Ligand binder design. Structure first.
Ligand SMILES: Cn1nc(Cl)c(Cl)c1Oc1ccc(S(=O)(=O)NC(=O)Nc2ncc(Br)s2)cc1
Ligand SMILES: Cn1nc(Cl)c(Cl)c1Oc1ccc(S(=O)(=O)NC(=O)Nc2ncc(Br)s2)cc1
Ligand SMILES: Cn1nc(Cl)c(Cl)c1Oc1ccc(S(=O)(=O)NC(=O)Nc2ncc(Br)s2)cc1
Ligand SMILES: Cn1nc(Cl)c(Cl)c1Oc1ccc(S(=O)(=O)NC(=O)Nc2ncc(Br)s2)cc1
Lengths: 317, 317, 317, 319
């Protein structure tokens, strides 16, 4: 039987017997994602170039408006907005959404892959909506994932029962279920990070990457990959295995990536696929935020590889 | 005024007052690229998954058929085909085409950037056509370039008078002139290579990469990017500046990339944009081929960055 | 606020808080409509014509497979099938759907307008399903409507509270609501029928056409339009006003158009918009079918015009 | 072998060993036809209805056709249904051709999603005077090429020239016109007539009789069927594809007809003849009328050759 994202979400909703508010959220999110992809692939560009005589701003506008009009959300935290967004009373619902509307849109001049990342939280108190409702630990996530605008457009959706991958067919505007319940390899052969920052590496990271290149035994050295776009680099790790690092050093003791709308959804997708995601000191999903735009270090991927990193990291503790 | 790819090539053809055989070729190749892009973006994939009840092989078949049926070619070399292709007598024209129909289609499961790379030669010998007609050095190219199937679909077109970039507008299926007479930065700040082969690196490469991480003049360290797909890495280098390296290792004593339909078209675009491309001993475009699938090492990019590598290279004899 | 067809159906579905089975139905039907439209507009025709080396049949297969796999249907009557289709046990649900997957596709060689017409009924008995579940009169319709593949693709959806029109935006694959709670004019200025059949006209129709061309009270005469595809003509009647006639004559005492999947869903749309639809003797919606493929004559449109037709009609006994 | 319109035009242009001006012309028109098609299909309508928080279609269509032709460097006078006076292309962008076009015919009923179309006729500039409006006052006999885009259930381009008529189907996945029907010819005699019978009370005595013969044939053969979409491009292309007759004739209230000679009557007549059909005004051939005004009207009766002749026989009985 053929399966779409919309058919998938309704069947899970009927199993759980909810009211439908979460499904209205996800459907709005898919629709916004399809409009973003259309703009990213440059539909209608000939008109700007004079046939008859902004991209991340538009992206944030498509996601914002579609969520407000869903009548299912109450607080929206975005990489584009300095303060959290409070939905007006007439359009209010019960969910909290943290998103990066166009991850990697800084290097979009080289036609690099870009993506939309989201984490969806349930609102905990009945107090007036405010920023405090987005300050939950990654363990509290209801669902999370990302859109990859790569050679094709794919939506990866993680929930309690696991991770599923959907492919956008642009002829009809439908996400097609193509990979059910994916699990990451127990141990990989690729390591992923920016080695240009070598002089600033934490001493454990230095040794761990050295062990990937010069094994003390006779194993094969690892290969290396780094796109510079999180949605792309993390998605390769899921599909091929290996380790992804944007770690802490003395210059950025808390890392560079934002915890809420980058680190948490990817940590969630990883753990639901059998992987791990750590800061070195603790699991990313266990961190309690105190600011919506706060940073977190992250090392994620295959479990044997993260354990091997934690072994070196603790050796230097 | 709006300019398209077809209008651009027709304008250049009347300037040159040629017959139009090259125009029919370029038009045929552009049609093949618009077809491949539609396949890479998964248009119509919903039917494969039963809505009504290989990709690089297809890419190879689309480029093969459109070039044959243009009546403009006589020898065709492809990464998918073990031997060169001899075009039948009724469809022969005066040009020779070397192409990789879907470069990077190995990592196409991680939705990595993929692309089509091509190089165009006027047949040189008057002999009956054979594989020897594709063994010309890259200096002899009439035109060269690539389609990058990234976040959007772009065609980069290089010729004697320079490099032009066209953006595919899928709404109307037309390439739109968006970057006229493009030039690479004189010097960049990103380096690109697979550091997993560090244990097999030649001493010259070992030293040059050391200089990128720990600069001797206390300048800021370069950043590193490595997609693992040549079309993406080169286009990022072209759009931003910097250096791209795939040198030899123990597994590849003659280097890894293919000279005919990977290294040379990229050497041509670089030099036509003001960049450089070397193997260490000589310019890639100066290499005289003896076998159609032969390998070459390559270091290319911004002119100041490649000169700095060769300076280190001659230090080690 | 922007509204899509999917948002419209879920919000109405939550208004009634039904099980979700009818929503899973309409979502599947909408998905088939987008697929038909893409093939009707000739997406991918280059592959059929050998770029790398039926339409009503595919249309019927898309609607059949998408409805079966919705788990919301058990009996399906289609213009393409001699007998009704009984859904297999594991996929049986509670709704009955009548559809013409591609109305007017015989004249598709002149690129005339084509359309999909559908009506949805509820299962009548709790016994095992059979054809009798589709032999309901039009008065029982839960929903009905049509897609018009014209200069654009529009979905007109009629239900208890009235009729709404949605426009397919092909860039993103979403139906956008453009006309809310539509009503036809009380009286129009256009009549629509095949006047080449003048020789077989009932005396009443002849007189009614006489008064439109030569008004006895010197009002201005009506204009004439006749496309020859029912979905197109009916939609023109709704948008501009007037009357559409395919009536009974001595040769076809029961008309030409089919009652289940052409006449009934169109009569339903008209009445829900403030119009009328008659066979001359009674309302179309009051007709009891005895065979899934039985015919009925139809006169529909503006209320003053249907009454003026019946006025002449009753004078002639 | 697969054939596209761009490949087809480059091949014919190379046979004739021309300069390339006419191919650059048609290529610009094909692109204008694809942008119009994309707009008529309502791509991007979600932005007009507030999905993220303009021009009428005939204004955009006329702007698209105008801009692409000027920028082709192949034209010098442009007559459009939208513009009162002829347009003289500025000196730096002048070429040798004159184009009379209707950019979106039938766009009045576009609210009922009726078929719409683009009609065009191409002339070479004849005189060596500085270009002016008079350069468009040539009779239809002078056409280099003519045709139409029909934005119907699919988008098709019909191109007529000296050697005949060819049809291309737009594949929107790649944006290419694909040659699908080569060298079309209309049937010698059809079974469909096309005109607005609602205005019967003003009919000329012959048109009354001819339509009388089609509904109640004197030889008791089967009657013709009637079709009238109300949009010229859809109706005429149906005539070409299936045969029959299309009529918009003269009456006492409109002695010169309603349709315009330059950008409606002549291009449809030209396509008809190059496919084996006829097109007449009753008194003379459409292609033989010498205009004195670029927006002057003409009656037109066109379609299968045998069907048009039966009209002219009735026409002359009434002198
Ligand atoms: C928790 N989680 N995370 C993802 Cl990801 C997915 Cl999937 C998923 O599973 C649910 C759970 C609850 C809901 S819900 O609360 O919205 N319930 C409904 O929608 N019920 C319906 N009734 C009629 C129709 Br038709 S659907 C939706 C999806
Ligand atoms: C050399 N180079 N490399 C690229 Cl890339 C491009 Cl662009 C370009 O420039 C030419 C040069 C020669 C030709 S040609 O030899 O084919 N001649 C013609 O096409 N003549 C025509 N006549 C009428 C029309 Br209309 S076009 C085409 C393009
Ligand atoms: C009857 N009619 N005809 C048309 Cl046309 C339309 Cl609109 C319409 O309105 C309904 C009424 C009931 C249903 S239903 O029985 O399927 N119920 C639900 O779907 N409930 C849901 N719960 C959560 C989510 Br989310 S939807 C569907 C549509
Ligand atoms: C007269 N007519 N009507 C239609 Cl319709 C068509 Cl088709 C057609 O036939 C010509 C004749 C001449 C030209 S032309 O004068 O523009 N010549 C060229 O384009 N020559 C070329 N050289 C290299 C390339 Br490549 S094409 C264009 C089309």
């Amino acid at each position: 039987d053929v399966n779409t994202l919309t058919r998938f979400v309704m069947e899970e909703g009927r199993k759980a017997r909810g009211t439908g508010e979460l499904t209205q959220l996800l459907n709005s999110l898919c629709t916004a994602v399809k409009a973003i992809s259309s703009a990213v692939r440059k539909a209608g560009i000939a008109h700007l170039y004079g046939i008859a005589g902004k991209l991340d701003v538009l992206s944030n506008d498509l996601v914002m408006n579609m969520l407000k009009s869903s009548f299912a959300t109450c607080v929206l935290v975005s990489e584009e907005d300095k303060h959290a967004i409070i939905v007006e009373p007439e359009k209010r619902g019960k969910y909290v959404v943290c998103f990066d509307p166009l991850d990697g849109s800084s290097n979009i001049d080289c036609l690099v892959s870009v993506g939309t990342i989201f984490g969806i939280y349930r609102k905990k108190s009945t107090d007036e909506p405010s920023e405090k409702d987005a300050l939950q630990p990654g363990r509290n996530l209801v669902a999370a994932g990302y859109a990859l605008y790569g050679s094709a457009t794919m939506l990866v959706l993680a929930m309690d029962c696991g991770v599923n991958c959907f492919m956008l067919d642009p002829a009809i505007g439908e996400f097609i279920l193509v990979d059910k319940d994916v699990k990451i390899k127990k141990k990989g052969k690729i390591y992923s990070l920016n080695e240009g920052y070598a002089k600033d590496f934490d001493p454990a990271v230095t040794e761990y990457i050295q062990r990937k290149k010069f094994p003390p035994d006779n194993s094969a050295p690892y290969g290396a990959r780094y796109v510079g776009s999180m949605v792309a680099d993390v998605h390769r790790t899921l599909v091929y295995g290996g380790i992804f690092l944007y770690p802490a050093n003395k210059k950025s003791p808390n890392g560079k990536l934002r915890l809420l709308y980058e680190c948490n959804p990817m940590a969630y997708v990883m753990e639901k696929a059998g992987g791990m995601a750590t800061t070195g000191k603790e699991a990313v999903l266990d961190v309690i935020p105190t600011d919506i735009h706060q940073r977190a270090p992250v090392i994620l991927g295959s479990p044997d590889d993260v354990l091997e990193f934690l072994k070196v990291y603790e050796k230097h503790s």
